[PDB]
């Protein structure tokens, strides 16, 4: 309505503006490596340190930024309290650069660790699985505002 | 002009007051303490969670620098 | 495919017929013509032989 429309423009949602400031991008890059040679450290086979790694950050992400909704503090009304952190990042704009960069790191993380677990397929279907059910649908055009039982 | 104000030594003139590289030793020690835990939010936990970051890092450290001998 | 996009912003809901209704009650138009100036301007018809 108006009300809700001039609440959440009144104020800088300060539960998503955090992303476009100094060293986000790059912090996603680093908890990756980090992950990486934490399950190196373990000792397995390369394939399940692997397969480990994409499992943890995917889920992770999913978890972060799809499953809780609404803002960790008092903002407005209620302005924003049907909305997960995925659907209040520049507020409501589809298509920005973070949206972009956000989504295209699953593909390239899938894509680096696929010349490990190649040889199995049960590996290969499930970690396919997983990458395009958890971490490039929900983060879809078609998929925003979209709630179902 | 004097006023109801008492002040407090600076650690270098307590240091002075008080008077070989033990001292040294020490200061890179305490360095390297401070160095490491400012950095991890430990001032913002309680003991118990602490307490297992701390196990938890040591543990990370030494399977680390075994994996490297 | 995903990087070719172009940053669009959600679309809007249309009007209703109530809100419809309300906004043309409040537009009003003018008058077919000026009837502000015709008083000094009508010395002409009465000065036509
Ligand atoms: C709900 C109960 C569930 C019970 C299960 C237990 C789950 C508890 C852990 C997850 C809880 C998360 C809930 C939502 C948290 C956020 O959204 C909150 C509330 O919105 N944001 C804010 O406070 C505003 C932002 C605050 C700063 C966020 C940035 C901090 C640094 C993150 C940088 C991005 C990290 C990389 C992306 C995620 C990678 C995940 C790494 C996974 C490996 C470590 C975790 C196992």
């Known amino acids: ?149 | 002009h004097k006023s109801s104000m008492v002040y407090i030594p600076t650690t270098k003139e307590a240091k002075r007051r008080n008077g070989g590289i033990l001292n040294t030793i020490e200061e890179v020690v305490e360095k390297l303490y401070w160095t490491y835990y400012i950095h991890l939010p430990f001032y913002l936990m309680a003991s118990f969670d602490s307490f297992f970051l701390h196990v938890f890092f040591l543990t990370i450290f030494s399977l680390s620098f075994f994996g490297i001998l | 495919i995903l990087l070719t996009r172009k940053s669009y912003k959600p679309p809007k809901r249309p009007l209703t017929e109530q809100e419809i209704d309300e906004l043309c009650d409040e537009w009003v138009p003018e008058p077919l013509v000026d009837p502000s100036a015709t008083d000094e301007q009508s010395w002409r018809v009465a000065k036509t032989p």
Do not use: C
């Open chain 1, 1 to 149: 309505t108006f009300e809700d429309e001039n609440d959440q423009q009144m104020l800088p949602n300060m539960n998503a503006t955090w992303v476009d400031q100094r060293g986000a991008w790059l912090i996603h890059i680093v908890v990756i490596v980090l992950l990486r040679l934490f399950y190196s450290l373990f000792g397995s086979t390369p394939k399940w340190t692997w397969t480990l790694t994409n499992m943890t950050y995917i889920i992770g992400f999913y978890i972060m930024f799809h499953l809780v909704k609404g803002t960790p503090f008092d903002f407005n009304g209620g302005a924003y309290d049907n909305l997960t952190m995925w659907e209040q990042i520049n507020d409501e704009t589809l298509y920005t650069p973070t949206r972009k960069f956000l989504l295209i790191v699953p593909i390239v993380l899938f894509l680096i660790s696929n010349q490990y677990y190649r040889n199995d397929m049960t590996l290969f279907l499930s970690n396919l699985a997983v990458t395009v059910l958890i971490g490039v649908v929900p983060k879809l055009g078609i998929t925003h505002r979209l709630r179902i039982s």
